[PDB]
Every structure is written in structure tokens, then in C-alpha cells.
Amino acid sequence: EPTYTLYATFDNIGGLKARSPVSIGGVVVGRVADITLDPKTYLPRVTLEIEQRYNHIPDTSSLSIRTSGLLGEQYLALNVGFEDPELGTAILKDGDTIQDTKSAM
Amino acid sequence: EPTYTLYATFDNIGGLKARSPVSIGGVVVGRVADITLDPKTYLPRVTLEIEQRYNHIPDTSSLSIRTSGLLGEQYLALNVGFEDPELGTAILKDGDTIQDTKSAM
Amino acid sequence: EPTYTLYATFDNIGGLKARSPVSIGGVVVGRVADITLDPKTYLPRVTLEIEQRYNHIPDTSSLSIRTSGLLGEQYLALNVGFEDPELGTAILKDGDTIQDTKSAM
Amino acid sequence: EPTYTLYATFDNIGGLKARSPVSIGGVVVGRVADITLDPKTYLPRVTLEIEQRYNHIPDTSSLSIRTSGLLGEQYLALNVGFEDPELGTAILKDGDTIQDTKSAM
Amino acid sequence: EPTYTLYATFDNIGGLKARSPVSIGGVVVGRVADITLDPKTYLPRVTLEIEQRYNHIPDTSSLSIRTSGLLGEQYLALNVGFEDPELGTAILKDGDTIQDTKSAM
Amino acid sequence: EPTYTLYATFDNIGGLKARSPVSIGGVVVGRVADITLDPKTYLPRVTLEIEQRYNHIPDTSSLSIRTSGLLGEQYLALNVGFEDPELGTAILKDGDTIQDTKSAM
């Protein structure tokens, strides 16, 4: 499965770990590859590997830390954004950063 | 049990998976066969297998994602729709799509 | 241990199953024998087996789907009805239907 | 341990069973000896065995079905009543009935 | 650990038992040794064993029955009382009673 | 893996114990080394061991007792404080005390 890399900074990653799934409408599209806490900014940075066939995600898209049911595992929900194509059509590409992140409750 | 195939699009399938039950007032009438995320719409599409003896379901029928108790598994609740007697018998058959769906939580 | 059979329609049986107990004020008096979908109404049809020593239950009696504590098993509570004696001797017998039912919400 | 017998009728005994404890301020003083559903009145009747040393319980005392924590066992809580001794000092004795009972929620 | 003995009367001890912990802000400082129901008052009396190194507890101190999380065990929370510096050092010793108690839930 | 030690006072440590993790935005940076009762205040005194690579934490930083999901483990969230740089270089070192703490309620 070919993949591309995205990065995202959160204030709080909760119980998120390496190989946590990334999902759109509940379907897994990717994985967390790495979590490192930046020693300078003390903000956790997440590296994701997204399957190449999910390739048209607007850069206004957001990432959320969520839980499966009441007592299941943490995952990242990627919320596919809107961008008016009449005003430029910025798409997340290999090596891009998702700016809009929502941390563990 | 011989089965027929129905399709349904949701915004979010939650923790629904292959072999999740489909029920009418809590009685199992079929199974989720397959879940795929369409790369064109980024909306999940579900393939269901419904037992052929439940073969007079009106096309007005709807599907809901629900949970068993507070803690338990996700399933699809099929809500049997109104059939106008004045204008004949518009019935789900192998390969039809249920238009009316409601997503997780 | 001789039993008589009664029938009941629910909108929704929740997690009720074959061999779920039937109780009067919390004492087991019977079992669910069978659950199917009625092909005419697509409503769940429950078959119950009641011990023959509990044989003077008024047909005004009702059934409720209930749960043991929080997160325990589903069961049927049979609520023994009031009978106006000036219309009396209206008693549930083998094959009768309990009209007044309350489903799982 | 010498015991005396008390009886109590409830509308609903919930998950109460033979050998369920009877307690005052959470300390076990007794046991359920028997539960029978009266085939005439369809009200559950409980027979208790109370340790003889707990012998001065006013007959205005009440019995409650309660649960240990959120998900533990059912028990009977005996709430020790008031009786003005200047107006007669009726005490529960061997073979007496507790009139004031509170059923499972 | 050498211990000293304290007593305490509650209305209701809930699911407290022998070996239930006694704590100060969540740190274990002793154990429940014994629970007896006094047949004269029908109020539970608790015998506690407190570690001798916690030996300057003011007699104004109170005890609470509490639960660990939503699901877990009952324990006694000892709330360290105010000591008036103007009127000397009124301190719990072996065999003393804590007057100020608060019962289950 | 070299660590430095910090100290912290709580009113109530809940179910926090030795080896409970310390986290910054959900990433483990350390461990609780020890919990005792301070003999002077009878308040819980917590010893923490933080990995030496996380060595520029402002002393305005706070600690909170938190739980993983609903009914999971207690841990300490270290909240990295704002520092007015015109009073800067006020940095937590081996042996320092975190003043700003939030207990289990």
C-alpha cells in the first residue's frame, strides 16, 4: 500500500500511540507512524502515513482525537474540509501539515 | 439462508464492521458484507446481505447505526418504511440502494 | 414441569433472546421460547412458556422488556393486570396473546 | 446462631434470592430463607431468619431491596423504626410480618 | 508497623469490611479491624488500627465512607481537624473515639 | 535513562500510586517515584522522576491528577506554564517543588 506523510501538532494526544488508526467517516485510511514531544515547544507532533488512494483532502481538513465507544481505543478522525475551488484548491500532499487539530477532551 | 444485496451510504459508520448484524426491532434479518470509503465522495458505502425471506421491504425504509446497551457492539437498525397502497408496491430488490440512512451517535 | 404458551408483539425486543426469563415481581414463572419477525407486520413476535401453576393471570396483564441492574441480562416482566370482576373470568390460556406490551427504548 | 422468622410481602423482589443477606446500617443480621410467589395474589413473599440477639426491632421498621455499589448483589436493608413507648411498644417477634416494604427500583 | 486503636460509630457502613483502608488525602494510614452492630443502639461501631507514626491527629478529626472511582472498594477518609493553638493539644490516642463521622453515599 | 526529581503537595492523590506516569500533552516524560504523608501538614507529598531531556520546564508549570478514559489508570498531567521572559530563566531543576497542583475530586 503506497503512503504519503502528513504531520499534525496537538496540545494533548491523550492515549494515542504509534499505529493508532486514522479514519474518515469511521473507515481506516492511515496510521500514526511516530509521536514525539518537541523538547523546545513541549507540543506533541504526530507523523501520519495516509494511503495514497485517499489523495484529494483539502488542507482546511481537521484532525480529532476520538475514542471507540465509551471504553475502546483512541484514534484520529480526519474531517474532510471545504475549499471553494474558484479561490484556489490547496490539497494535502506528501510532507504537508494539517493546521486544524482538536486534542483529547 | 439465501440473501439479496443492498447498498447504503453513511457520513460515518462508527465501529460498524464486516459481519455486524442488520436488525428489524432487534431481530437479525442480515449482515454487513463489506465497507468501502469511496475516494470520490469520502463517504462510506456499506454492502448488506438481507435474508431472502424478508423480501417485501419498502424502498422508503431507512437504516440507523445503533449500539447494543451502553457498552456493546454497533449494528444497523432497518426501519420499515410506509408503503402507499394507492400507488403500488415499490420494494427493495437485489442490488438496490437504501437512500435514507442515519450515521453513528 | 408443564408449561402453557402465550404470544406477544413488540416494536423492539432489544437484547432479549430465546431462554430469557419471564418474571412476576422478580420471580421466574417462565421463559422466552422463540423470537421471529412477523412477515405481515415486520414486527417481532415472541413466544413465551409459562409454568402451569401460574394459571389465573388476567388477560389485562402486560409484558415489559427490562434489564437486571445496569449492564445485566434482558428479561420480560409480566405485570398482573386489574380485572373488573363484573366482566370476570378473562384468564390467559395456552395459545392466548398478551395485547399490552412495552419495548426496549 | 439462634434465629427467629419474619415474613415480608413485596410487589417486586428484583434479583433477591435464597440466602441474600438482611442488614441494619450495612451489618448482616439475617438471611432470606425462602421466596415464594403466592399463586392467588401474585405477590412475592419473603421468609427471613434474623439472629436472636437483634431482638428489639419496632414493628414500624421497614425493609428495602438495595444493591451493593452500582453492579453488586441485591440485599434487604432493615430500617429500624420509631414507636413512642408511652403509646405501646410493639416489637417484631418470631413469626411476625413487616408491613412496610419497598421493592426493587 | 505498630498501631493504636480508634473507634467510630456510623449510621450505615455500606460495603466497608475488615481490612478496608483508612486514608488521609488518599494515603493509607491504617485499617478497619472489626465492625460490630451494637444491639442497644442498632448503630454500627468500627474499630480502626492507625499506624503509630500518624500520632498527632486532633480529636476534632472526622471520618467519611468513600468509594475508589465509580466501581471500586469502600474506604474511610480521615479528615484532619483544626487544632486551636490558643487552647493546647487535644490529640487522638489508643482507645479514643472519633465523634465526627459521615455514613455511606 | 537519566532523570531529575521534583516534589509536589496535593490535598488528595486519589488512586495515584508509585510508577503512575507523568505526561506532557499525553506523552510520558516521567514517573511517580514515591507518595507519603508529610508529618507537618498531614498532606500527601509526591516525588516525581522526570527524564533529563525534558529540562526547560518553567517553574510556573502545574500538575493535575487525571484518569485514562472513564475507568482507567490515574496519572499526573504536567501543564507547561507561561513565563514572563522579563523575569525569565526560572526553570525546574533536580530537587525543586511544583507549587501549582490540582487534586482528585
* Cβ–Cβ < 8 Å for E80, F38: no
Residue B58, Cβ density class (10 Å: 0-12 exposed, 13-18 middle, ≥19 buried): middle
In the DSSP assignment, the letter for residue E86 is: G
Resolution (A): 2.3
Amino acid at A97: T
Sign of the C-alpha dihedral computed for residues A21, A24, A29 and A35 taken in this order: negative
Chain C positions with Cβ closer than 8 Å to B: 10-16, 35-37, 39, 42-44, 67, 70-71, 103-104
Q: How far is B54 from chain A (nearest CA, A)?
A: 28
**Which chain F residues are Cβ-neighbours of E25 within 8 angstroms?**
10-13, 37, 42-44, 103
Amino acid at D22: V
Contact: D27, E36; criterion CB under 8 Å: yes
Residue D8, Cβ density class (10 Å: 0-12 exposed, 13-18 middle, ≥19 buried): buried
In the DSSP assignment, the letter for residue B41 is: T
Which residues make Cβ contacts (< 8 Å) with residue B8, sequence separation at least 6?
A: B45, B46, B48, B63, B76, B97, B98, B101
DSSP D28-51: EEEEEEEEEE-TTT--EEEEEEEE
Cα–Cα distance measured from residue C60 to residue C78, given in angstroms and rounded to the nearest whole number: 11
Helices H, strands E: what count in chain B?
Answer: 0, 8
Q: What is the largest CA-CA distance in chain D?
A: 44
* Cβ–Cβ < 8 Å for E67, D69: yes
Which letter, b or e, does each residue of C22-38 get, where b requires 16 or more Cβ atoms within 10 Å of its Cβ? bbbbbbebbbbbebebe
Q: What is the largest CA-CA distance in chain B?
A: 44
Cα–Cα distance measured from residue F26 to residue F80, given in angstroms and rounded to the nearest whole number: 12
Who among D53, D69, D72 is closest to E39 (CB)?
D53
Amino acid at C27: V
Is F102 part of any domain? no
Where do runs of H (alpha helix) occur along D4-99? none
CA B43, chain centre distance (Å): 15
Neighbours of C55 (CB within 10 A): 14
Nearest to C68 by CA among D69, D16, E69: D16
Helix (H, G, I), strand (E, B) or coil at B86: helix
Q: How far is D55 from chain E (nearest CA, A)?
A: 8
In the structure grid, which three cell numbers stand for residue C11, read together?
A: 416494536
* Cβ–Cβ < 8 Å for F48, F32: yes
Distances (CA, A) of B42 to A53, A63, B7, B74: 11, 15, 16, 21
Strand order in the sheet with D100-102: D96-97, D3-9, D44-51, D27-37, D21-24, D74-79, D62-67, D100-102
Helix (H, G, I), strand (E, B) or coil at D9: strand
Q: What are phi and psi of B85, to 5 degrees?
A: -65, -25
* Cβ–Cβ < 8 Å for E70, D70: yes
Distances (CA, A) of F83 to B22, F9, F26, F27, F89: 57, 22, 21, 22, 9
Cα–Cα distance measured from residue F18 to residue E28, given in angstroms and rounded to the nearest whole number: 13
Q: What angle do CA A62, B34, A29 make, to 5 degrees?
A: 25
Q: What are phi and psi of C42, to 5 degrees?
A: 50, 35
Residue with cell 476520538: A66
Neighbours of F56 (CB within 10 A): 13
* Experimental approach taken: X-ray
Q: What is the largest CA-CA distance in chain F?
A: 43
Strand order in the sheet with B74-79: B96-97, B3-9, B44-51, B27-37, B21-24, B74-79, B62-67, B100-102
Beta bridge partners of B51: B3
Strand order in the sheet with F44-51: F97-98, F3-9, F44-51, F27-37, F21-24, F74-79, F62-67, F100-102
Q: What are phi and psi of C103, to 5 degrees?
A: -85, 165
Which domain covers residue D60, as residue numbers? 3-100
In the structure grid, which three cell numbers stand for residue B49, read together?
A: 446481505
Nearest to C27 by CA among D45, A68, F57: D45
Helix (H, G, I), strand (E, B) or coil at E27: strand
Distances (CA, A) of D102 to B97, C81, C88, D96: 53, 20, 30, 18
Q: What are phi and psi of D25, to 5 degrees?
A: 50, 35
* Cβ–Cβ < 8 Å for F25, A15: no
Q: What angle do CA D24, D25, D26 make, to 5 degrees?
A: 85
Q: What angle do CA A80, A81, A85 make, to 5 degrees?
A: 125
In the structure grid, which three cell numbers stand for residue B32, read together?
A: 454487513
Question: In chain F, where do the E strands start and end?
Answer: 3-9, 21-24, 27-37, 44-51, 62-67, 74-79, 97-98, 100-102
Contact: E35, D24; criterion CB under 8 Å: no
In the structure grid, which three cell numbers stand for residue E81, read together?
A: 481537624
Rg over CA atoms, chain A: 13
Which residues make Cβ contacts (< 8 Å) with residue B68, sequence separation at least 6?
A: B75, C14, C15
Nearest to D77 by CA among D87, D92, D91, D62: D62
In the structure grid, which three cell numbers stand for residue D40, read together?
A: 392467588
Helix (H, G, I), strand (E, B) or coil at B32: strand
Question: CB-side exposure of D88: number of CA atoms within 13 Å?
Answer: 3
Contact: D27, E44; criterion CB under 8 Å: yes
Cα–Cα distance measured from residue E70 to residue C97, given in angstroms and rounded to the nearest whole number: 43
Chain B positions with Cβ closer than 8 Å to A: 10-16, 35-37, 39, 42-44, 67, 70-71, 103-104
Chain E positions with Cβ closer than 8 Å to F: 24-27, 29, 53-54, 56-57, 68-72, 80
Who among F37, F67, F71 is closest to E24 (CB)?
F37
Distances (CA, A) of D58 to A11, B68, C11, D87, D101: 62, 46, 48, 13, 14
Number of domains composing chain C: 1
- In SS3 terms, chain A reads as CCEEEEEEECCCCCCCCCCCEEEECCEEEEEEEEEEECCCCCCEEEEEEEECCCCCCECCCEEEEEECCCCCCEEEEEECCCCCHHHCCCECCCCEECCEEECCC
Cα–Cα distance measured from residue B4 to residue B18, given in angstroms and rounded to the nearest whole number: 16
Helix (H, G, I), strand (E, B) or coil at D93: coil
* Cβ–Cβ < 8 Å for F20, F28: no
Which residues make Cβ contacts (< 8 Å) with residue F20, sequence separation at least 6?
A: F31, F32, F73, F74, F75, F76
Chains contacting chain E through 3 or more C-beta pairs under 8 A: D, F
Question: In B10-102, where do the E strands start and end?
Answer: 21-24, 27-37, 44-51, 62-67, 74-79, 96-97, 100-102
Beta bridge partners of E31: E21, E49
Neighbours of F18 (CB within 10 A): 11
- 3-state class percentages of chain D: helix first, strand second, coil last, to nearest 5: 5, 45, 50
CA C98, chain centre distance (Å): 7
Q: What is the largest CA-CA distance in chain E?
A: 44
Which residues make Cβ contacts (< 8 Å) with residue A13, sequence separation at least 6?
A: A35, A44, A46, A65, A103, A104, F25, F26, F27
Cα–Cα distance measured from residue D5 to residue D7, given in angstroms and rounded to the nearest whole number: 7
Q: How far is C38 from chain D (nearest CA, A)?
A: 31
Q: Which residue of A has its CA nearest to B40?
A: A56
Amino acid at E34: D
* Cβ–Cβ < 8 Å for C73, C67: yes
* Cβ–Cβ < 8 Å for B100, B8: no
* Cβ–Cβ < 8 Å for D44, C27: yes
Distances (CA, A) of F62 to A13, F7, F27, F101: 18, 12, 16, 6
Neighbours of B59 (CB within 10 A): 16
